[PDB]
Symmetry: C4
Subunit: 68 residues, 4 copies
């Protein structure tokens, strides 16, 4: 008897907790002295790149237009 | 013949292992000298912020009250 | 028409890639000078703790005994 | 009334955002001075190892040959 609900609860807790934690690790890493002056790892540049990636995948699976 | 059970096993192993690993990486990063004195990255502050985020998403999908 | 197969493919690629990457980040972070001599972040200690966590969750959902 | 669609949306946003963020954290960590000259953590070596892992799991669940 596979408990899909409990599996979903664990899955969600893990992925939400991981994303919230990784967002902080990304900010801390952006402040590291060995990437100062490296445009690729400037925090605003990273956030924009991540935003574009997430938005494009979301648009593939959950398009704003439900009748393309 | 898609093996949903084996897919679920891989998914769970990955997300649980990742979350357990990320929790440790977060602790190590909190101790980094370049974020000393930065309240945003103080470990207790980060943990509270993460806790609030996880709790709010869990309450959206798995509310304590099953008859709202 | 929700493409569950393509969604599953993206989900798996992401979680497997993330776990493989996080395993390396964990190793690099274990070598950081600010956690030298901190038993909590000694690599073998971290790996054992992670292993116990993953094993216990896997045993909850996919027990070795299929007739408890 | 469990909203599978909204759950899927949150799951996808989290895993895609996490993977995009972790890919950047991996690059920053590869540049860390304490792993200079350590072949295990050379960036190209890490990327190849990750690629092999992702490819093998993808081939297990979504084989290029649909009639083995």
């Amino acid at each position: 008897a596979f408990n899909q609900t409990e599996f979903n609860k664990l899955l969600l807790e893990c992925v939400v907790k991981t994303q919230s934690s990784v967002a902080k690790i990304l900010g801390i890493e952006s402040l590291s002295p060995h990437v100062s002056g490296n445009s690729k790892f400037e925090y605003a540049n990273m956030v924009e790149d991540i935003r574009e990636k997430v938005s494009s995948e979301m648009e593939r699976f959950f398009p704003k237009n439900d009748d393309e």
